[PDB]
Amino acid sequence: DFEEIPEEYL
Amino acid sequence: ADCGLRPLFEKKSLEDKTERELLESYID
Amino acid sequence: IVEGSDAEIGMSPWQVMLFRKSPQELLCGASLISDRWVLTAAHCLLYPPWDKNFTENDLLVRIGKHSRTRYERNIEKISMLEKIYIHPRYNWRENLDRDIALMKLKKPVAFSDYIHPVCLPDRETAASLLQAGYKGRVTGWGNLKEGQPSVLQVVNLPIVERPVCKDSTRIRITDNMFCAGYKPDEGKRGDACEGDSGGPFVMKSPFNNRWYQMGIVSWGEGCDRDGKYGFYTHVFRLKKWIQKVIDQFG
Numbered sequence: 522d523f524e525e526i527p528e529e530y531l
Numbered sequence: 532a533d534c535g536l537r538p539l540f541e542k543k544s545l546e547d548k549t550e551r552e553l554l555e556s557y558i559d
Numbered sequence: 560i561v562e563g564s565d566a567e568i569g570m571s572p573w574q575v576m577l578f579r580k581s582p583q584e585l586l587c588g589a590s591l592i593s594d595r596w597v598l599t600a601a602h603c604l605l606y607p608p609w610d611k612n613f614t615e616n617d618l619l620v621r622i623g624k625h626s627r628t629r630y631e632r633n634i635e636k637i638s639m640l641e642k643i644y645i646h647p648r649y650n651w652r653e654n655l656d657r658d659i660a661l662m663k664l665k666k667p668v669a670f671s672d673y674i675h676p677v678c679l680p681d682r683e684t685a686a687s688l689l690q691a692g693y694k695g696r697v698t699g700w701g702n703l704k705e706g707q708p709s710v711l712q713v714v715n716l717p718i719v720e721r722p723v724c725k726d727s728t729r730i731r732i733t734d735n736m737f738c739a740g741y742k743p744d745e746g747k748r749g750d751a752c753e754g755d756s757g758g759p760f761v762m763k764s765p766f767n768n769r770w771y772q773m774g775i776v777s778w779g780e781g782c783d784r785d786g787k788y789g790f791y792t793h794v795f796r797l798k799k800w801i802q803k804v805i806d807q808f809g
């Protein structure tokens with residue numbers, strides 16, 4: 522469903 | 532201070548498709 | 560949003576998505592009120608009967624969005640939360656009285672064509688605009704029925720008279736709530752729904768052309784049901800608390 526967001530945000 | 536003013540609408544004086552409906556409802 | 564339509568690009572640049580880190584999922588709407596602060600319904604963060612008690616770290620806010628699921632590169636900004644503040648007298652035990660919460664972002668978000676804060680009303684704007692018949696606008700990526708939308712949805716609804724609101728439910732209605740929606744067979748319908756919570760109910764001032772957030776999407780007994788209405792947190796009635804938190808920790 523959801524598109525991977527950049528890992529810097531995690 | 533510049534709150535509530537939309538760059539793609541109010542700042543360039545364009546109106547969204549349904550804002551007129553809101554204004555039309557403010558009768559008094 | 561039930562029975563709404565596709566929001567236009569930049570139509571609601573204060574719309575904020577409240578997004579869970581893992582599993583990755585939309586939690587609620589929220590709205591942007593300054594470069595450091597985001598407003599949302601308290602029940603989006605804290606709701607013990609469902610073991611909901613989110614910490615700053617469990618969450619992110621996504622601002623400037625249009626598409627629900629896409630990572631909208633160069634368009635949206637994703638922020639981490641510095642601190643959460645829940646109204647001290649938010650009544651989750653009974654009726655979600657004072658359903659409001661502020662979120663301070665770790666860093667200021669930069670404005671753009673897609674990211675711009677909404678105004679909060681003062682006493683005069685409240686009095687002047689919060690009247691039965693007057694329409695406001697609700698936006699969100701919540702359910703389309705009581706699946707999920709590809710894009711931000713919008714619906715305009717009229718504010719309903721206090722006695723009609725009270726007469727539509729067994730729930731005890733407080734002065735910190737107002738309801739909106741069409742009555743049966745007015746020929747029009749529409750409502751918020753699960754996932755829209757915390758999102759903004761806004762009205763455009765005909766005195767200064769500014770958008771003001773009058774309500775926060777709070778609750779409803781179903782979605783777009785005939786004879787039922789959406790309930791919203793009355794933002795101006797809780798302004799002393801908003802100003803308090805902002806003046807203290809900002």
Ligand SMILES: C[C@@H](C(=O)N1CCOCC1)N1CC[C@H](NS(=O)(=O)/C=C/c2ccc(Cl)s2)C1=O
Pocket residue numbers: 602606655750751752753754755756776777778779780781782783788789790791
């Ligand atoms: C009564 C209320 C409640 O007790 N809540 C809200 C959710 O978080 C826990 C407490 N509640 C429980 C389920 C219900 N969600 S829902 O039926 O999907 C219609 C959501 C909304 C319709 C109109 C507005 Cl405004 S919003 C809802 O709003």
Ligand SMILES: [Ca+2]
Pocket residue numbers: 725726727728729730
């Ligand atoms: Ca009743």
Ligand code: NA
Pocket residue numbers: 740741749750783784785786787788
């Ligand atoms: Na209804």
